Design a protein around this ligand. Structure first.
Ligand SMILES: *[C@@H]1O[C@H](CO)[C@@H](O[C@@H]2O[C@H](CO)[C@@H](O[C@@H]3O[C@H](CO)[C@@H](O)[C@H](O)[C@@H]3O)[C@H](O)[C@H]2NC(C)=O)[C@H](O)[C@H]1NC(C)=O
Ligand SMILES: *[C@@H]1O[C@H](CO)[C@@H](O[C@@H]2O[C@H](CO)[C@@H](O[C@@H]3O[C@H](CO)[C@@H](O)[C@H](O)[C@@H]3O)[C@H](O)[C@H]2NC(C)=O)[C@H](O)[C@H]1NC(C)=O
Ligand SMILES: *[C@@H]1O[C@H](CO)[C@@H](O[C@@H]2O[C@H](CO)[C@@H](O[C@@H]3O[C@H](CO)[C@@H](O)[C@H](O)[C@@H]3O)[C@H](O)[C@H]2NC(C)=O)[C@H](O)[C@H]1NC(C)=O
Ligand SMILES: *[C@@H]1O[C@H](CO)[C@@H](O[C@@H]2O[C@H](CO)[C@@H](O[C@@H]3O[C@H](CO)[C@@H](O)[C@H](O)[C@@H]3O)[C@H](O)[C@H]2NC(C)=O)[C@H](O)[C@H]1NC(C)=O
Ligand SMILES: *[C@@H]1O[C@H](CO)[C@@H](O[C@@H]2O[C@H](CO)[C@@H](O[C@@H]3O[C@H](CO)[C@@H](O)[C@H](O)[C@@H]3O)[C@H](O)[C@H]2NC(C)=O)[C@H](O)[C@H]1NC(C)=O
Ligand SMILES: *[C@@H]1O[C@H](CO)[C@@H](O[C@@H]2O[C@H](CO)[C@@H](O[C@@H]3O[C@H](CO)[C@@H](O)[C@H](O)[C@@H]3O)[C@H](O)[C@H]2NC(C)=O)[C@H](O)[C@H]1NC(C)=O
Ligand SMILES: *[C@@H]1O[C@H](CO)[C@@H](O[C@@H]2O[C@H](CO)[C@@H](O)[C@H](O)[C@H]2NC(C)=O)[C@H](O)[C@H]1NC(C)=O
Ligand SMILES: *[C@@H]1O[C@H](CO)[C@@H](O[C@@H]2O[C@H](CO)[C@@H](O)[C@H](O)[C@H]2NC(C)=O)[C@H](O)[C@H]1NC(C)=O
Ligand SMILES: *[C@@H]1O[C@H](CO)[C@@H](O[C@@H]2O[C@H](CO)[C@@H](O)[C@H](O)[C@H]2NC(C)=O)[C@H](O)[C@H]1NC(C)=O
Ligand SMILES: *[C@@H]1O[C@H](CO)[C@@H](O[C@@H]2O[C@H](CO)[C@@H](O)[C@H](O)[C@H]2NC(C)=O)[C@H](O)[C@H]1NC(C)=O
Ligand code: NAG
Ligand code: NAG
Ligand code: NAG
Ligand code: NAG
Lengths: 48, 559, 48, 49, 49
């Protein structure tokens, strides 16, 4: 039970990492960059 | 050739049929054979609110174009042969006319003066006048119920796409149901602003006058909407079936599996039912422009070695006012933020630096570069966020007294001022007077020799730096608020924070100097309204899970 | 890819105009291109 | 030592570097340095990239 | 069908093409199709395979 709970909690909390992008949040990236530049930022988050 | 008159005005009648499962077209030239692809775009939803018009009965209302218009005609004879495209339907703005007269197609883009009731004319079973317009101004472009024709009109990137389809039906009244596919024919390039679409139809008379609508025809209009659909391609590539993934609970389950048949069991589905339509924009209400004149029309700029800093706050930033002025920037680069979206943000700490440099030294005011200015005069941090502006001032700054630092032991840090005058010695030995082994650190810009080159001309440089989404903002773009909507999942924008979700009420207590509510997963949940000074709540439009039980495709369709 | 060949008067407040004057201005402006000894930035250019 | 070029009366209108960063040009050791010089038109400077 | 210049596939691998000069369809097949296996008795044993 503890293993399942820990796995779920870690999966939930893994979203805080931004990998190689500029921010973990996706709203601000689209709020300051053009889509041609935002696609590169979104791709690494998707892969991670 | 002039235009006729119709004093009689019968009130138009409006009825509501449905489009069944029609209004599909080849959305791309990519040849797909024997596969299924899920594509999103602007299509006609199944079972739409199609409208019918008839033809004294003469209805030619101004139909808004929107994102696209679906046009289908049912007739026994050629009576409908053209359409009118335009924005104001006058001679002030250009308009497009497409009619069928001869060899290929008659299409014209011009400044027309349409009459009240544009129409064709056929007398004694032969061609007659063309009472559509009466004047053609300065224009460029020129190029030359058993019947059911369907046309789809779309205008994107200045291209007008036309789709055609022909079918044979025998129905006295009512739009027939079934499946139809349209193939593109025209890709006419013309840059216009299409907002309204009209139709032109022929009228018949006996010899020359007393035109009457002897022949009646039925045509339907449909509005395209943003929908997600799944398509199937045969070996030839012809579309044979499709599903609109918003109609019934079975539709989204079928779309998720990416198939056309289902097995008995229970499956999990995604969200394909609710889409926000309302927007909630909120900005703090202040009204005052920045002192653009005080920074772009300051009669005195210092040298680069003595650059000065200015603070900007409590503004409504508007870069469009700079167009009216007589300033022509020769360099405009931005780092971090895109220049396109500079009017939809809220800056938190704006600072400006101004000085004078040589014409060939403008390039050295970028981060990560080298040069005497970048080493001893002015350096930018590697994480600089802002924009750089520069312009020529050969007519105000053709004087003497400007200097730059030439000799210095170390390299200055970013954002550092080194206004000094002490003597310099390469060996580090202290000096006592200017002469041998002692030189003046500063050097002159000349700027007084007649007939100097472009690279040696004086230039004025202004650097803007700001921070985003860390502290409460004082400078924001020129945007107006649209009050507050409750109990709906909508698209909000609070000081440049796009999001989606329901907002009803909040009871959370927090500390001042706060504008956003974070989370352990970096997902926004609360926000402070800058206009009502009260906290709100954000919750996604979809929260729970949905499962659908089906007995099989052969068995039945009830779920 | 849009063409906006128009000549109607412009008003910042959106109120329709009747003549050029107060609160009504000409949308188009001149390139000069005739002053002697203009700079390189003010010279005409041809773009394809 | 690129800093000695500042004392001279030469004003470069184009300075681009590939592979190595201009900032750290004084903390390296080059192995095989070669130089080529010629004369071109003003509008043909961009074609030397 | 007409208005076609390339032959696609479910894996986006070209297999057919229309010659613009003879106006007839061709076929594309990779130079290597089958699998090859080699049996060896060991380096010390011999070199015949
Ligand atoms: C693409 O569409 C065609 C539409 O006809 C599909 O039907 C096939 O069409 C061909 C060409 O007309 C037929 O060939 C003809 O069949 C008979 C018997 O030989 C005769 O009229 C002619 O001598 C000629 O051979 C073909 O029979 C017909 N097939 C069927 C099942 O009706 C065609 O299948 C589609 N192609 C693909 C690759 O999916
Ligand atoms: C712009 O922001 C300002 C603050 O910078 C806000 O000022 C507030 O204006 C509202 C307008 O509705 C005032 O509320 C009114 O107060 C009394 C209550 O007895 C009454 O006249 C009305 O029933 C209404 O509730 C509010 O007092 C005022 N705040 C102050 C003066 O401290 C304002 O919300 C923004 N302006 C707008 C929305 O026009
Ligand atoms: C573009 O720039 C021009 C030139 O600066 C602007 O014209 C100026 O407009 C202001 C108002 O915005 C005028 O000030 C007003 O003028 C009269 C004086 O009797 C009076 O209405 C007010 O007391 C006030 O001082 C100013 O005179 C005028 N300058 C001129 C015409 O040389 C123009 O408004 C700007 N914007 C555009 C054209 O959209
Ligand atoms: C801020 O000011 C301080 C104090 O003047 C600067 O530190 C000074 O830096 C210079 C240049 O690196 C040092 O000179 C060197 O000193 C010895 C001989 O005295 C020798 O290593 C070299 O031949 C050279 O002359 C100087 O000693 C040093 N002073 C101190 C007290 O540390 C500092 O560089 C300035 N900051 C910036 C960013 O310019
Ligand atoms: C920056 O460039 C100037 C101009 O070239 C340099 O001045 C020159 O400095 C050299 C030594 O580095 C001088 O040569 C010496 O001059 C006297 C001649 O009696 C004597 O000490 C030696 O025999 C030797 O020839 C040269 O005359 C002088 N040129 C001038 C002043 O026109 C300067 O050193 C450079 N560096 C700085 C200012 O840091
Ligand atoms: C260039 O493309 C053109 C089409 O735009 C092609 O035209 C074709 O030219 C060939 C040349 O061999 C003609 O074939 C010949 O036809 C007769 C058959 O009785 C005979 O003279 C030869 O035995 C040969 O087969 C072909 O008819 C012609 N097509 C037409 C006129 O419609 C041509 O392939 C290309 N030009 C070349 C390859 O030089
Ligand atoms: C579109 O409209 C047609 C015409 O009204 C509908 O077809 C009718 O469907 C009902 C369903 O109860 C049948 O009883 C009628 O006999 C049908 N009439 C005809 C003329 O076919 C059709 O169902 C509608 N499609 C929708 C609403 O999706
Ligand atoms: C429709 O009317 C036009 C305009 O009156 C006619 O234009 C003629 O087009 C034919 C070819 O169809 C040309 O040979 C003539 O030279 C055109 N006339 C003139 C005066 O230029 C035409 O008869 C009709 N069809 C088309 C396609 O324009
Ligand atoms: C609209 O067409 C007219 C007629 O060709 C053009 O107006 C002429 O413009 C020239 C410019 O040198 C003037 O000298 C003439 O007096 C004008 N004539 C008339 C009758 O007004 C006008 O330029 C066109 N508009 C465009 C191309 O935007
Ligand atoms: C700042 O604005 C002033 C006007 O307020 C400009 O001064 C004019 O400059 C032009 C161009 O040199 C002269 O022909 C005019 O005589 C000047 N005065 C007026 C009243 O128009 C000035 O150029 C602007 N820019 C600066 C100082 O950089
Ligand atoms: C659309 O058609 C439906 C019935 O299909 C009808 O109830 C409705 O009033 C029509 N109009 C609109 C605007 O939805
Ligand atoms: C444009 O239309 C207006 C309104 O009818 C009219 O007054 C004006 O004369 C027309 N201009 C031309 C050039 O035909
Ligand atoms: C569905 O029913 C048809 C009716 O003949 C049958 O032939 C077919 O095999 C069935 N399909 C599946 C997937 O079981
Ligand atoms: C191959 O043969 C040599 C011959 O002495 C032997 O020593 C060696 O161990 C052998 N190598 C292997 C990998 O068995």
């Amino acid at each position: 039970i503890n293993q399942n709970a820990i796995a779920l909690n870690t999966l939930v909390k893994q979203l805080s990492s931004n990998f190689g992008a500029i921010s973990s949040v996706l709203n601000d990236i689209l709020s300051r960059l053009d889509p041609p530049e935002a696609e590169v930022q979104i791709d690494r988050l998707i892969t991670g | 050739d002039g235009c006729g008159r119709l004093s009689q005005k019968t009130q138009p009648k409006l009825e509501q049929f449905n489009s069944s499962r029609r209004g599909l077209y080849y959305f791309d030239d990519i040849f797909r054979s024997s596969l299924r692809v899920l594509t999103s775009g602007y299509f006609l939803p199944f079972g739409s609110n199609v409208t019918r018009y008839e033809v004294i009965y003469y209805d030619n209302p101004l139909v808004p174009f929107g994102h696209g218009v679906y046009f289908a005609v049912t007739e026994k004879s050629n009576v409908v042969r053209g359409w009118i495209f335009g924005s104001t339907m006058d001679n002030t703005t250009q308009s497009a006319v497409l009619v069928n007269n001869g060899t290929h197609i008659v299409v014209n883009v011009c400044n027309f003066n349409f009459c009240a009731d544009p129409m064709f004319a056929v007398s004694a079973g032969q061609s007659y006048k063309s009472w559509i317009y009466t004047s053609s101004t300065n224009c460029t472009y020129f190029q030359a119920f058993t019947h059911l024709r369907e046309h789809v009109f779309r205008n994107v990137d200045g291209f007008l796409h036309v789709y055609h389809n022909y079918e044979v039906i025998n129905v006295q009244n009512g739009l027939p149901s079934g499946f139809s596919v349209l193939r593109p024919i025209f890709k006419l390039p013309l840059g216009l602003n299409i907002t309204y679409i009209k139709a032109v139809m022929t009228l018949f008379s006996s010899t020359t006058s007393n035109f009457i609508a002897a022949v009646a025809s039925l045509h339907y209009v449909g509005y395209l909407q943003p929908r997600t659909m799944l398509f199937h391609f045969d070996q030839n590539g012809t579309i044979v079936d499709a599903i609109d993934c918003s109609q019934n609970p079975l539709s989204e389950l079928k779309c998720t599996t990416k198939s056309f048949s289902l097995e008995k069991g229970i499956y999990q589905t995604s969200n394909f039912r609710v889409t926000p339509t309302t927007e909630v924009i909120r900005f703090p209400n202040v009204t005052q422009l920045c002192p653009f004149s005080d920074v772009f029309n300051r009669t005195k700029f210092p040298s680069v070695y003595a650059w000065e800093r200015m603070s900007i706050r409590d503004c409504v930033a508007d870069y469009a006012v700079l167009y009216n002025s007589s300033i022509s920037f020769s360099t405009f680069e931005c780092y971090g933020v895109s220049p396109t979206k500079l009017n939809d943000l809220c800056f938190s700490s704006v600072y400006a630096d101004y000085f004078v440099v040589r014409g060939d030294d403008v390039k050295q005011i970028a981060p990560g570069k080298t040069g005497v200015i970048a080493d001893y005069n002015y350096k930018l941090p590697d994480d600089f966020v802002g924009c750089v502006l520069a312009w020529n001032s050969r007519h105000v700054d053709s004087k003497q007294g400007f200097y730059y630092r030439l000799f210095r032991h170390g390299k200055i840090k970013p954002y550092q001022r080194d206004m000094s005058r002490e003597l310099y010695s390469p060996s580090g030995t202290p000096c006592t007077t200017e002469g041998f082994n002692c030189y003046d650190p500063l050097a002159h810009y000349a700027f007084a020799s007649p007939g100097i080159g472009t690279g040696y001309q004086p230039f004025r440089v202004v650097v803007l730096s700001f921070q985003l989404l860390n502290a409460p903002a004082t400078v924001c773009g020129p945007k107006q608020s649209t009050d507050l909507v409750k109990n709906k999942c909508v698209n909000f924008n609070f000081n440049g924070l796009t999001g989606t979700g329901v907002l009803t009420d909040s009871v959370k207590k927090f500390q001042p100097f706060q504008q956003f509510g974070r989370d352990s997963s970096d997902f926004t949940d609360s926000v402070k309204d800058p206009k009502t000074l009260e906290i709100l709540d954000i919750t996604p439009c979809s929260y729970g899970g949905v499962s659908v039980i089906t007995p099989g495709t052969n068995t039945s369709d009830a779920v």
